[PDB]
Amino acid sequence: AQITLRGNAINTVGELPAVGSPAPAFTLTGGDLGVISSDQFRGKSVLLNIFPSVDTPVCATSVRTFDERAAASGATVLCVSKDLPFAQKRFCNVMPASAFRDSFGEDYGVTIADGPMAGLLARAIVVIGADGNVAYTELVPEIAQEPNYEAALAALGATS
Numbered sequence: 001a002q003i004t005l006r007g008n009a010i011n012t013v014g015e016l017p018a019v020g021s022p023a024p025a026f027t028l029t030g031g032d033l034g035v036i037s038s039d040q041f042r043g044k045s046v047l048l049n050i051f052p053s054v055d056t057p058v059c060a061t062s063v064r065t066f067d068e069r070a071a072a073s074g075a076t077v078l079c080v081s082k083d084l085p086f087a088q089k090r091f092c093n094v095m096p097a098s099a100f101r102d103s104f105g106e107d108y109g110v111t112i113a114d115g116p117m118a119g120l121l122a123r124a125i126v127v128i129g130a131d132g133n134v135a136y137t138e139l140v141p142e143i144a145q146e147p148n149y150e151a152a153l154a155a156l157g158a159t160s
């Protein structure tokens, strides 16, 4: 077999939702196999912390710290990935949500299109304001780049 190497540039299936527009609806799957619907967060700010996988015994302080500050600002934090619900309980108003059987990755333009990680969601951050509109987005452009947590927090603070 030949190895499908991983390119430095992140290439997803689409565009992140535009800042200022209504956040696309979603119906993710929760730990109890029920639905985590975007309608459930009406009137609340939401931080979608998106990962290729949260199935790792590692919880970088950078991630924990960010999630804690976000939750402290009054936002509901969803750690979204293609991992099945069963495997999401291993990661670090903060809960995991799985996109294994819904269109979240395509609707939010974050599904990785090629390479060894094709089909998983790219590292990205989407902040939805309490008013329901997208307040901030960042699709991390390269594989080993850390998200701009500071900018996301300023956007979060602005739409609590």
Ligand SMILES: [N+]
Pocket (backbone or CB within 6 Å): 055, 086, 087, 088, 090
């Ligand atoms: N797991």
Ligand SMILES: [N+]
Pocket (backbone or CB within 6 Å): 114, 115
């Ligand atoms: N490719």
Ligand SMILES: [Y+3]
Pocket (backbone or CB within 6 Å): 015
């Ligand atoms: Y464009």
Ligand SMILES: [Y+3]
Pocket (backbone or CB within 6 Å): 037, 039
């Ligand atoms: Y509904």
Ligand SMILES: [Y+3]
Pocket (backbone or CB within 6 Å): 142
């Ligand atoms: Y570069």
